[PDB]
Amino acid sequence: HSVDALNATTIDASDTVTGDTVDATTTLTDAAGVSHTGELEDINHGSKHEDGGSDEI
Amino acid sequence: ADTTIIDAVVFPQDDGTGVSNGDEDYDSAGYLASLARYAGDGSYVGGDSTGSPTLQFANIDTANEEVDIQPGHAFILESGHIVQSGSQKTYDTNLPDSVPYVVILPSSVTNVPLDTDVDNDVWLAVDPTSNDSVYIRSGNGLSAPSDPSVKLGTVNSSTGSTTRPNDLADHSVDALNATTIDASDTVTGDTVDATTTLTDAAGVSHTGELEDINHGSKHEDGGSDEI
Amino acid sequence: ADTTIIDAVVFPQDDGTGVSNGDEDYDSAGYLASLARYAGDGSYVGGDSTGSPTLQFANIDTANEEVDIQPGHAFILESGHIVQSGSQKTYDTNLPDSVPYVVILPSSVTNVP
Amino acid sequence: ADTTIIDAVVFPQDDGTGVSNGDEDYDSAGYLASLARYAGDGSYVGGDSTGSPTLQFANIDTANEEVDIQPGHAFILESGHIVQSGSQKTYDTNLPDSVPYVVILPSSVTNVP
Amino acid sequence: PQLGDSKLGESQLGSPGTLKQGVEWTVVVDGEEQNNVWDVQVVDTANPFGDYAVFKMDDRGGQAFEAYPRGTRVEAYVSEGTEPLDNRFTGYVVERRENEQQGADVLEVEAYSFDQFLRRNTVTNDQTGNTISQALADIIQTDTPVRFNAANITVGDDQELTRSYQGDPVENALRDFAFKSTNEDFGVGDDLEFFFQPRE
Amino acid sequence: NTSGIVGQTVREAGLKSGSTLLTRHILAEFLLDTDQRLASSESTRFTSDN
Amino acid sequence: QDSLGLPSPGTQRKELQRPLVTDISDAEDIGRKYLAFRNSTLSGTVTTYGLYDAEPGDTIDITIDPRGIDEEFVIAAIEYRWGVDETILTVVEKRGDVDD
Numbered sequence A: 001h002s003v004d005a006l007n008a009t010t011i012d013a014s015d016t017v018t019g020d021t022v023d024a025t026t027t028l029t030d031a032a033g034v035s036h037t038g039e040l041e042d043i044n045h046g047s048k049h050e051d052g053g054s055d056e057i
Numbered sequence B: 001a002d003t004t005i006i007d008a009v010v011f012p013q014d015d016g017t018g019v020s021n022g023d024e025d026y027d028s029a030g031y032l033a034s035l036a037r038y039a040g041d042g043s044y045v046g047g048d049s050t051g052s053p054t055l056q057f058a059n060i061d062t063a064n065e066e067v068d069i070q071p072g073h074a075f076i077l078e079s080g081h082i083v084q085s086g087s088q089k090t091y092d093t094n095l096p097d098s099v100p101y102v103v104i105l106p107s108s109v110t111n112v113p114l115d116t117d118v119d120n121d122v123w124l125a126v127d128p129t130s131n132d133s134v135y136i137r138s139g140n141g142l143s144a145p146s147d148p149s150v151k152l153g154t155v156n157s158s159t160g161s162t163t164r165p166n167d168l169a170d171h172s173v174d175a176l177n178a179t180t181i182d183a184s185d186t187v188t189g190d191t192v193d194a195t196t197t198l199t200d201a202a203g204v205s206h207t208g209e210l211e212d213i214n215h216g217s218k219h220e221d222g223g224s225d226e227i
Numbered sequence C, D: 001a002d003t004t005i006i007d008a009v010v011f012p013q014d015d016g017t018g019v020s021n022g023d024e025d026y027d028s029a030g031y032l033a034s035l036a037r038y039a040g041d042g043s044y045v046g047g048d049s050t051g052s053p054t055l056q057f058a059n060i061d062t063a064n065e066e067v068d069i070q071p072g073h074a075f076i077l078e079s080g081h082i083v084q085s086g087s088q089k090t091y092d093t094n095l096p097d098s099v100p101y102v103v104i105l106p107s108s109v110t111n112v113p
Numbered sequence E: 001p002q003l004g005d006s007k008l009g010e011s012q013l014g015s016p017g018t019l020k021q022g023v024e025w026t027v028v029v030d031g032e033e034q035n036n037v038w039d040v041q042v043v044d045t046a047n048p049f050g051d052y053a054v055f056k057m058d059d060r061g062g063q064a065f066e067a068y069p070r071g072t073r074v075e076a077y078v079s080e081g082t083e084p085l086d087n088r089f090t091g092y093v094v095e096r097r098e099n100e101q102q103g104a105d106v107l108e109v110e111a112y113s114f115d116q117f118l119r120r121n122t123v124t125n126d127q128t129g130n131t132i133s134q135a136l137a138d139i140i141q142t143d144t145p146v147r148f149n150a151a152n153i154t155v156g157d158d159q160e161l162t163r164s165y166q167g168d169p170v171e172n173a174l175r176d177f178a179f180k181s182t183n184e185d186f187g188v189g190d191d192l193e194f195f196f197q198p199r200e
Numbered sequence F: 001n002t003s004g005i006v007g008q009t010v011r012e013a014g015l016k017s018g019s020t021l022l023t024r025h026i027l028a029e030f031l032l033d034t035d036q037r038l039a040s041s042e043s044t045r046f047t048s049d050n
Numbered sequence G: 001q002d003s004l005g006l007p008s009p010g011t012q013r014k015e016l017q018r019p020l021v022t023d024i025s026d027a028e029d030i031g032r033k034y035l036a037f038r039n040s041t042l043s044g045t046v047t048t049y050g051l052y053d054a055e056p057g058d059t060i061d062i063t064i065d066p067r068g069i070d071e072e073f074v075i076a077a078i079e080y081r082w083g084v085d086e087t088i089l090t091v092v093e094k095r096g097d098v099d100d
């Protein structure tokens, strides 16, 4: 089946849910089962931890 | 700027649509099959056996004022139809909602007129006063047809640029289940759950958890994943 | 429990659906068009031209007896329909699966208890 | 190679489809409703009232060849159907795109070779 | 039957209808279909000769005569059996004639086509020292109302013109060019585009 | 070689009474080139509705 | 142009030479006369009886209801035929054929 705009309550798929943009307002639950509700760690972030930066250790 | 298509067909049509009593549509198999092909909520342009939008633009003649509509079909909603109360001959029940016509264009509409050097709106329109009377409006910023209609696209006759709404079904549903789902743009939702894998924007498959910001507290003495 | 709607309509209906041979539905365009609008797998209430559900609840008094149902349409599946094989007029083939009627309400149902 | 199914029904069919002038289908409600169940874009095997696929395979015999098919309905497309323009009797207008037949098997097929 | 005139299950799909057989010519007149037509003649010819059509129809109180002023667009479409409609003639009205034929009021419409525009125009510029390809461009763009597409021109023996063709009918000049070259076909397509290309 | 009109494409014409326009016509396009005279053959007709 | 959908105005043209004409207004008039005498026209025949006193250049009321005609026309030619008893009126204009 092919559409322009699917407007739904719930969507559920037994193989790939692909998109060249995925947008998760309100919640994301990962492959392990942790339910995030804020921004995420980019790779090679470590510079942030260094003197005076955000999320210092 | 107006154009009749001689071989276009509109279905279905009754005394309770806009036609006179001698002029109701005939009960063809192909019409029932093509009407049953509807799968949206609005007016839209139908797709082929492989999901391509029919009624394509082809052979756009640059600044030379002309464009070709390829063959296909469109679903056009009209509101205000009358139906027959069960086993009465008389049309008496005014419908509460808008209901689709199929418009089938069996051949190419060739060299449709555009106004020069400007934006033009390509409207496909049905005249519900007579059987199978179909027309295209295509003019500079030209006002939408009064009669049941859909916008097949819009064309700028300076650059030859073309853009188009309504090219497949818009589809309000409550619940959907699938094998695969594959969007062009935004896969949007108030929750995204990965049951076996999330593969990220760089194409890396995370088997385990993802990591939120403000994480560094974990790398400290006695935390999980200490450094 | 029963509030009977004097202006509601149901389509399509035959001998094979349950009605008597004198009483089969007439084949209006408006019926064909509204029937074609079905797309789901089960039974459901239909959405308007904007994608908003019809047959809404209205005038929902908190503590009085009565409520209003808005106009619109719904799809209701039934199984065990009979159809006519080939060019035989006789209803002879039982359907293997359930199939939709359209129920259409042209007005608001006023003050359902 | 053959397996002629003796109880299947196909709709819609008229001489705009490939049939003779005597051999047109009848205008049954159950057919209209089952045809209204189309929502896809290609040919597909239809789901029951829950969404579970019909026309399931069953009872494979392996080294002894044979297999069974359950009841259900399939949508098969066909190209180049003719329809009747406007108020005309005559089939005159070729459809540009492929359109569905609902194929209904009302009972199981036993021991396909 | 027709929709709304039969109760369900009672009648056969699309009855009493059947597949179209025979030949039909449809006449279109500024986009309107002419419905009372009883004969059509369409003639399509090589360049010395005019392409034309004659349409014969019934009229009542001169209502149809009024539809066909001189220069009115006429199109003739043909179908045989269940074949799609094919646009076989496009032209403009040159004569409308209504006469009594033994009681009948017969309207005869005669139409000429695009080949008239190559015929009734003259070469204005001097093409001395132009190639045939260069000459065709100049002549078709300057002296004729039809559209020029360089891709429709295939000169089989391109050579320089030593004559000033500066007063000849365009058709006569083009035929002289074809004689000098490889005997090419020329004319106006249904695209309204000029062509000049090898035969057969 | 009238100043405002030579080198120009001409598209319209009209009969006038001082400033007031009496008739208006659309012409087929032409360039009024150097040394060319331009003239009108403006036919005004008075008839009845039969 | 608008009828046929031509890129540019639908020119159909003749070239004449009148070498002994020195005045431009006469050359204009010759060109105008050329256009006028072959400009599109109503012509044609009405068959009646009598009208012996009618001359070309005279005016006559003609009503032909099946043809939708109810007009006052100039007579271009009259033909009287005995035997068949016909008066043939040519109205508005007369033009030849191969003769022209």
Ligand SMILES: [K+]
Pocket: E178, E179, E180, E181, E182, E183
């Ligand atoms: K030669």
Ligand SMILES: [Mg+2]
Pocket: B009, B010, B011, B012, B013, B025, B131, B132, D086
């Ligand atoms: Mg129709």
Ligand SMILES: [Mg+2]
Pocket: B015, B021, B024, E004, E005
């Ligand atoms: Mg009727």
Ligand SMILES: [Mg+2]
Pocket: B059, B061, B066, B068, B110, B111
């Ligand atoms: Mg083109």
Ligand SMILES: [Mg+2]
Pocket: B086, C009, C010, C011, C012, C013, C025
């Ligand atoms: Mg009913």
Ligand SMILES: [Mg+2]
Pocket: C014, C015, C020, C021, C022, C024, E009
């Ligand atoms: Mg019955």
Ligand SMILES: [Mg+2]
Pocket: C059, C066, C067, C068, C110, C111
């Ligand atoms: Mg109330």
Ligand SMILES: [Mg+2]
Pocket: C086, D009, D010, D011, D012, D013, D025
């Ligand atoms: Mg059948």
Ligand SMILES: [Mg+2]
Pocket: D059, D061, D066, D067, D068, D110, D111
């Ligand atoms: Mg078995």
Ligand SMILES: [Mg+2]
Pocket: B027, C027, D027, E001, E006, E007, E008, E009, E011
């Ligand atoms: Mg019927």
Ligand SMILES: [Mg+2]
Pocket: D014, D015, D020, D021, D024, E014, E015, E016, E017, E018, E019
């Ligand atoms: Mg038939």
Ligand SMILES: [Mg+2]
Pocket: E044, E045, E046, E051, E115, E187
């Ligand atoms: Mg030709």
Ligand SMILES: [Mg+2]
Pocket: E044, E045, E046, E047, E048, E049, E050, E051, E115
């Ligand atoms: Mg020719």
